[PDB]
Design a binder for this molecule. Structure first.
Ligand SMILES: *C(=O)[C@H](CCSC)NC=O
Ligand SMILES: [Mg+2]
Ligand SMILES: [Mg+2]
Ligand SMILES: [Mg+2]
Ligand SMILES: [Mg+2]
Ligand SMILES: [Mg+2]
Ligand SMILES: [Mg+2]
Ligand SMILES: [Mg+2]
Ligand SMILES: [Mg+2]
Ligand SMILES: [Mg+2]
Ligand SMILES: [Mg+2]
Ligand SMILES: [Mg+2]
Ligand SMILES: [Mg+2]
Ligand SMILES: [Mg+2]
Ligand SMILES: [Mg+2]
Ligand SMILES: [Mg+2]
Ligand SMILES: [Mg+2]
Ligand SMILES: [Mg+2]
Ligand SMILES: [Mg+2]
Ligand SMILES: [Mg+2]
Ligand SMILES: [Mg+2]
Ligand SMILES: [Mg+2]
Ligand SMILES: [Mg+2]
Ligand SMILES: [Mg+2]
Ligand SMILES: [Mg+2]
Ligand SMILES: [Mg+2]
Ligand SMILES: [Mg+2]
Ligand SMILES: [Mg+2]
Ligand SMILES: [Mg+2]
Ligand SMILES: [Mg+2]
Ligand SMILES: [Mg+2]
Ligand SMILES: [Mg+2]
Ligand SMILES: [Mg+2]
Ligand SMILES: [Mg+2]
Ligand SMILES: [Mg+2]
Ligand SMILES: [Mg+2]
Ligand SMILES: [Mg+2]
Ligand SMILES: [Mg+2]
Ligand SMILES: [Mg+2]
Ligand SMILES: [Mg+2]
Ligand SMILES: [Mg+2]
Ligand SMILES: [Mg+2]
Ligand SMILES: [Mg+2]
Ligand SMILES: [Mg+2]
Ligand SMILES: [Mg+2]
Ligand SMILES: [Mg+2]
Ligand SMILES: [Mg+2]
Ligand SMILES: [Mg+2]
Ligand SMILES: [Mg+2]
Ligand SMILES: [Mg+2]
Ligand SMILES: [Mg+2]
Ligand SMILES: [Mg+2]
Ligand SMILES: [Mg+2]
Ligand SMILES: [Mg+2]
Ligand SMILES: [Mg+2]
Ligand SMILES: [Mg+2]
Ligand SMILES: [Mg+2]
Ligand SMILES: [Mg+2]
Ligand SMILES: [Mg+2]
Ligand SMILES: [Mg+2]
Ligand SMILES: [Mg+2]
Ligand SMILES: [Mg+2]
Ligand SMILES: [Mg+2]
Ligand SMILES: [Mg+2]
Ligand SMILES: [Mg+2]
Ligand SMILES: [Mg+2]
Ligand SMILES: [Mg+2]
Ligand SMILES: [Mg+2]
Ligand SMILES: [Mg+2]
Ligand SMILES: [Mg+2]
Ligand SMILES: [Mg+2]
Ligand SMILES: [Mg+2]
Ligand SMILES: [Mg+2]
Ligand SMILES: [Mg+2]
Ligand SMILES: [Mg+2]
Ligand SMILES: [Mg+2]
Ligand SMILES: [Mg+2]
Ligand SMILES: [Mg+2]
Ligand SMILES: [Mg+2]
Ligand SMILES: [Zn+2]
Lengths: 96, 77, 62, 48
RNA sequence: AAUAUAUAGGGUGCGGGAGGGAACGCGGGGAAGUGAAACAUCUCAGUACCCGUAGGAGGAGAAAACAAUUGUGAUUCCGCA
RNA sequence: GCCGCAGCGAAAGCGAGUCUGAAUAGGGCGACCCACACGCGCAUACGCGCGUGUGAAUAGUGGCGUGUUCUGGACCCGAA
RNA sequence: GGGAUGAGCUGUGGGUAGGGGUGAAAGGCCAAUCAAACUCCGUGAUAGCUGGUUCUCCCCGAAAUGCAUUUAGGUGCAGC
RNA sequence: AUGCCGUGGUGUAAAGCGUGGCAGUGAGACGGCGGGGGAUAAGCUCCGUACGUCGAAAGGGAAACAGCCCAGAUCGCCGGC
RNA sequence: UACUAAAAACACAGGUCCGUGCGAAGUCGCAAGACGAUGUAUACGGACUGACGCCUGCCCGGUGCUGGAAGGUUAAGAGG
RNA sequence: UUGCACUACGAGUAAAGAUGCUCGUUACGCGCGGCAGGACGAAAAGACCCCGGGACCUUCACUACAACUUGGUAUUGAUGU
RNA sequence: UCUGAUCGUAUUGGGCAUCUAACCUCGAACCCUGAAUCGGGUUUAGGGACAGUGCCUGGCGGGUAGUUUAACUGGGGCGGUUGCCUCCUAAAAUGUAACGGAGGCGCCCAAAGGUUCCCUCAACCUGGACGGCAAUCAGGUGGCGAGUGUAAAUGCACAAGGGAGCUUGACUGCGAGACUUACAAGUCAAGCAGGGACGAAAGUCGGGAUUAGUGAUCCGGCACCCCCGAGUGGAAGGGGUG
């Protein structure tokens, strides 16, 4: 910058650390379940990969954005708190 | 040759003065007059400030006036 | 070859969900006794990188 | 001659405040009531 | 032999080495200009150069290995990461 | 394998939210349609909330052009 | 014009090598080159400096200011 | 007095603003008006000026004459003001 | 001072100081080895002065050189 | 050596010292020999000066390093006090 | 069981002396050796756990090496200057240059902060033991010529100037909306909540009449929170907040 202290040395570093052991989830919303499976039934991790909702080889996680109106029965990892509500209130279940 | 060893320095100009003029519509919180001392005094819906900074307390219109010799800044909501 | 990113700028800038670039604020690490709490609260948190710096900062992050 | 002194709570011992006194006009440790955010109320505060 | 045991040395007889080669391998030694808009840490770069030594390739290689509760099962090379 | 598919946070984490906070305070960042038919307690007719849409207006990614750019001698010539 | 039996001149053969030689000492001399020789390589050394940069038309069209600068003939950002 | 800020009218295509791509420039010069430095010298030097021209502006005038006065060259004509 | 300076510059004989007891000090080499020297303090190396004549005064605070070691401070090792 | 060429002078003017521009004045075309006022003549990318870079030299500038030197420890044993 | 002394046992270390066998000798003789001032071996004469050398460690070290040694500037050098605050220049908004004209700052105050209430000054005149131009007193007159921790400007007599009582807001969690601005910075802020001070209440208080009294990042230190913890449980180390 011509000789003065540049923008990448005037400013402080962003605080914190990166977690080395951070587990990451691939996210599916329960409103996407209603559009992808409008008949209900069993929904596994393999059934979400083929439907394009989620990536391969990764831990999935159901979140509760949208409106679930079908009677699905979904197995996944780590359900959300508002996603366990909408699945049972539509008539189904959610297991690990 | 000699030198001006005793002179040559100054502070920065502080950008003081009236910032919103008369009849001009302002928002709540807008600075009206920036000054040293009270060259202007607060009026209705105007507060002074920590370094005599005469801001707005209420949205309205700026109007200047006189109140027993002193000149004041007021807001008409 | 392959473009190396800038190590010192990636420790100072990051991106939000929409693509804004945020930074932290200076005058906060030490000498904090004569600074009132109206000033350290002003210098707290993050702000968006200003429009006149966003072209050079985006190229340091890429 | 005007050192930076720190004030600690007399209950939880947290060093909540920093200020300045005169080392000669006030040669012993200050005592002030200040707000302690841990206790959530006003406590007494000496120096350290 | 000196000097006794002997040894150094000497005699005799068979073998082998020595030098050259364009690049590639392994082992060792090792810069500077340059970059840092100065400069010493740092970079350049283990590069250039040098020394020893191969082979048709060489080096590595058969877990005192990883991994993390599941497991994989010598090395080398390539693509990802 | 890479990029798109959810973000927020130092992180644990939680997730259309989330961090800070005592806060059901405010603020940051991120999602979020009324242009609209019926209607629901309706509001001067207005539009807040949800179904069926009236069937709203968006999206990425791989090629190949071109401009700038990074690393290389990097437009070319020139020292002591 | 100086020396011209001397610390003389000369022939032949030899020795000392580059941060080194040699010097009755001038930084002299070391192959017409010396305040660190020559040659090849690193190498296309580097130069905020000077120069050069090759056919056409159409449309628009500056700046020589501010701020910061080991900065002032350079550059970053703003202005245009 | 001007200038500056706000607002209501009226006027005026190539104004203004936001966000991207690519710039160049950051040595200015003289003239008018206001001021500093200098001796109220300088073709001096440093600032101000919705001032001007040159820079980057040909044509007419000032004998000649970047910066002054008039006027802004799409091309052609042996027309006119 | 080959090639713009021949001098008052350098050298010199004489002077003084300092080092050196012998594969000496000093120098050349990583070392071995060499030179000094087939020499031995009347010798050899360094520094300064420069035939000769008459002379060479005062200062040991600064800074070096030589000798000392009572006190202060101080490394690795030991101690833990 | 060389951008050209049927290359005058005076007073001016202009990047402020004009063969080339303005206004004048003077001069038939072309050779030969001489002189050295101008062509800011030729030659040498000014040695002076300043700015940027370099080199060598200096020292109580900075950081290193050879040399020289101190102690511990290994090579390294035995016995008295 | 203490200080001091003495003694024993065991362990460790320093001096001092002697020894010879490591090692050392460019001291001598003999052999390899025919020709050898080299070398090696053998014996002798000396020296000797010293020296020399390896590793580690301190000193000294222009002997050598790589380098740095600022800019501004009416050429450069020399002198002066460099950041912040106030005034004039500055042309009645803001802003504006010069080695133009004048000054200050790198602090100070536990009250010189907060709040509640009360007061009015300097100068002049008259009278008065010491006592004077001027100390303290009394009466007049006096609208600010005094004062303000500290330069100057803008302010302040309604007081922001003088006195007094209680106090710690010289708070924590925040902050709509502005000023200034290339950027980094700087500055102001109504109001909301917690827990407080003063006040009967209204209210006011996030240091000081206001503007100087300061220093980015990196790298660390300390205190707390208990976020991560390289198989696991801890720890080391890191992270957040002050
Ligand atoms: C001055 O030192 C002198 C001036 C030259 S005059 C053009 N230069 C000598 O070398
Ligand atoms: Mg700087
Ligand atoms: Mg000012
Ligand atoms: Mg304040
Ligand atoms: Mg901190
Ligand atoms: Mg604080
Ligand atoms: Mg006190
Ligand atoms: Mg025998
Ligand atoms: Mg061979
Ligand atoms: Mg280098
Ligand atoms: Mg460099
Ligand atoms: Mg450079
Ligand atoms: Mg093999
Ligand atoms: Mg994230
Ligand atoms: Mg929110
Ligand atoms: Mg497409
Ligand atoms: Mg003669
Ligand atoms: Mg002769
Ligand atoms: Mg003669
Ligand atoms: Mg030499
Ligand atoms: Mg000389
Ligand atoms: Mg020569
Ligand atoms: Mg050299
Ligand atoms: Mg190279
Ligand atoms: Mg080049
Ligand atoms: Mg145009
Ligand atoms: Mg410039
Ligand atoms: Mg630019
Ligand atoms: Mg643009
Ligand atoms: Mg300029
Ligand atoms: Mg230029
Ligand atoms: Mg100018
Ligand atoms: Mg003028
Ligand atoms: Mg001028
Ligand atoms: Mg002008
Ligand atoms: Mg013209
Ligand atoms: Mg124009
Ligand atoms: Mg003209
Ligand atoms: Mg004309
Ligand atoms: Mg006519
Ligand atoms: Mg000569
Ligand atoms: Mg001569
Ligand atoms: Mg010797
Ligand atoms: Mg002697
Ligand atoms: Mg001497
Ligand atoms: Mg002499
Ligand atoms: Mg002599
Ligand atoms: Mg003495
Ligand atoms: Mg001594
Ligand atoms: Mg003329
Ligand atoms: Mg003429
Ligand atoms: Mg002509
Ligand atoms: Mg003629
Ligand atoms: Mg002739
Ligand atoms: Mg001439
Ligand atoms: Mg010439
Ligand atoms: Mg030149
Ligand atoms: Mg030793
Ligand atoms: Mg030793
Ligand atoms: Mg010395
Ligand atoms: Mg040197
Ligand atoms: Mg270098
Ligand atoms: Mg200079
Ligand atoms: Mg000068
Ligand atoms: Mg003005
Ligand atoms: Mg003004
Ligand atoms: Mg000063
Ligand atoms: Mg008080
Ligand atoms: Mg103050
Ligand atoms: Mg008061
Ligand atoms: Mg404080
Ligand atoms: Mg805010
Ligand atoms: Mg409260
Ligand atoms: Mg009460
Ligand atoms: Mg408040
Ligand atoms: Mg740093
Ligand atoms: Mg562990
Ligand atoms: Mg820890
Ligand atoms: Mg906080
Ligand atoms: Zn407490």
């Amino acid at each position: 910058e011509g000789g003065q202290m540049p923008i990448h040395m005037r400013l402080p570093k962003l605080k914190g650390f990166r977690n080395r052991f951070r587990t990451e989830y691939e996210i599916v919303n329960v409103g996407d379940i209603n559009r992808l499976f409008p008949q209900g039934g069993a929904v596994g991790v393999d059934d979400l990969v083929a439907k394009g909702a989620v990536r391969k080889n990764a831990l999935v996680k159901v979140l509760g954005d949208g409106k679930l109106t079908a009677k699905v029965d979904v197995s996944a990892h780590k359900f959300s708190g508002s996603a366990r509500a909408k699945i049972t209130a539509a008539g189904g279940s959610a297991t690990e | 040759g000699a030198s001006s060893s005793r002179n040559g320095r100054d502070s920065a100009a502080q950008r003081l003065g009236v910032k919103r003029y008369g009849g001009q519509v302002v928002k709540a919180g807008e600075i009206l007059v920036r000054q040293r001392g009270t060259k202007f005094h607060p009026g209705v819906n105007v507060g002074r400030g920590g370094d005599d900074t005469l801001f707005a307390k209420t949205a309205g219109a700026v109007e200047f006036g006189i109140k027993r010799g002193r000149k004041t800044v007021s807001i008409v909501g | 070859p392959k473009a190396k990113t800038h190590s010192g700028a990636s420790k100072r800038f990051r991106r939000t969900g929409t693509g804004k670039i945020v930074r932290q604020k200076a005058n906060r690490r030490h000498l904090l006794e004569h600074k009132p709490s109206t000033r350290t609260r002003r210098l707290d948190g993050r702000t968006v990188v200003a429009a006149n710096d966003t072209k050079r900062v985006t190229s340091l992050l890429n | 001659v005007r050192p930076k002194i720190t004030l600690a709570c007399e209950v939880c011992k947290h060093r909540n405040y920093i200020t300045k006194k005169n080392r000669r006009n006030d040669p012993d440790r200050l005592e002030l009531k200040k707000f302690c955010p841990n206790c959530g109320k006003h406590q007494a505060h000496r120096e350290t």
